[PDB]
C-alpha cells in the first residue's frame, strides 16, 4: 500500500501538463438597448433589459 | 546605540548665545541659540530652518499644510565668537566678584 511519486517532476514536464489550463474568454456582446457589456442568452446587467426591463437595476 | 555623550555630555555654549555655523550649507552663517539639548548634542539657531510637510489631517484642521520651521544641528556648528568669526575658546578666569568663569578667546570676554 501507499503509492508515492518516484522522482521529482521536471519543470519542463510539469509545465506541459498545464498546457490545458487556459481560461476561455467570455464571448461578450454589445447590449442593443443599454450601452455595452452583455453575456448572451442572459439579461444585460447594467440596464436590466432582455427586451424590455426585467430585473430592477 | 549610545549617542551624543561621547562629548562627555557637556555643551560648549549656552542657551542664549550668538553662534556661527561651519559645516555644510550653512557655513559662515550666524544666529542666536534657541534650543540646546546637550545629551543629543542638538542646537537650534534662527535661519537654518526648513519645510516640514505637516500632519495630513486633524491637528484642529482638515487639510494638512506645509510651513517653515526650525531644524536643529549636531554641535557641528562652531561656538561662541567675538573677534568676529570662527574662534576657539579658553578663558575661564573670574569676572567681577571673581566667581563667574567667564569666556574669552585670544581676546576679551564673551
Amino acid at each position: 500500500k501507499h503509492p508515492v511519486p518516484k522522482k521529482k517532476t521536471s519543470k519542463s514536464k510539469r509545465d506541459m501538463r498545464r498546457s490545458h489550463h487556459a481560461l476561455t474568454a467570455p464571448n461578450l456582446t454589445e447590449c442593443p438597448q443599454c450601452h455595452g457589456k452583455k453575456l448572451s442568452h442572459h439579461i444585460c446587467p447594467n440596464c436590466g433589459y432582455y427586451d424590455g426591463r426585467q430585473v430592477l437595476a | 546605540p549610545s549617542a551624543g555623550s561621547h562629548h562627555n555630555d557637556k555643551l560648549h555654549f549656552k542657551k542664549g548665545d550668538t553662534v556661527i555655523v561651519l559645516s555644510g550649507k550653512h557655513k559662515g552663517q550666524t544666529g542666536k541659540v534657541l534650543l540646546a539639548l546637550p545629551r543629543d548634542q542638538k542646537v537650534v539657531v534662527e535661519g537654518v530652518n526648513v519645510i516640514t510637510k505637516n500632519v495630513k489631517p486633524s491637528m484642529t484642521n482638515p487639510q494638512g499644510g506645509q510651513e517653515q520651521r526650525e531644524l536643529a544641528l549636531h554641535a557641528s556648528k562652531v561656538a561662541l565668537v567675538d573677534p568676529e568669526t570662527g574662534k576657539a575658546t579658553r578663558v575661564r578666569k573670574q569676572i567681577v566678584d571673581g566667581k563667574k568663569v567667564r569666556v574669552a578667546v585670544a581676546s576679551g570676554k564673551t
Binding site: 489550463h21 481560461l23 474568454a25 467570455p26 461578450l28 457589456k37 | -
Partner: protein
Amino acid sequence: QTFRNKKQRKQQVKLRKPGFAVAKYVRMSPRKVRLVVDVIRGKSVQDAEDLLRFIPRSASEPVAKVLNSAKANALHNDEMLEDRLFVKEAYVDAGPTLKRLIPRARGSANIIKKRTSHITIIVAEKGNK
C-alpha cells in the same frame, strides 16, 4: 545627453514608470491570478475592463482594481489619451508567504502556505502601429 558620472545622473534625471501600477501583497495564489491575468494580456484596455466583469474567477476583482489604477496613472500623471490605451504588459509575481500549522491524523502537523501576489499592469498607447 552624456553625463559626467552616475552621481551625475541621479541628480539630473529621475526614473519614472509610465502606465504602470502594482498591487503588492494581494492575498491570493499567483498561479490563479495568472490564469485571469493571461486573459487580459495585450487586449485593448476597454476590453480588459469588459472581460474582467464576466470572468467568474475570484481574482478578477483585485486584477481589475489594478487595471483601473494603470488607466488612471496613464491619464492623470502621464497625460496619455485613453482611446489609444491597451495593456502592453501584465504579470504576477510571488509575494511573501504566510504559514500555519494545521493538525493532521495521528499527531503530525503540516505547514500550509497562504500565498500572496504582486499583480502588476502596464498600459501604453496603441500608437505602436
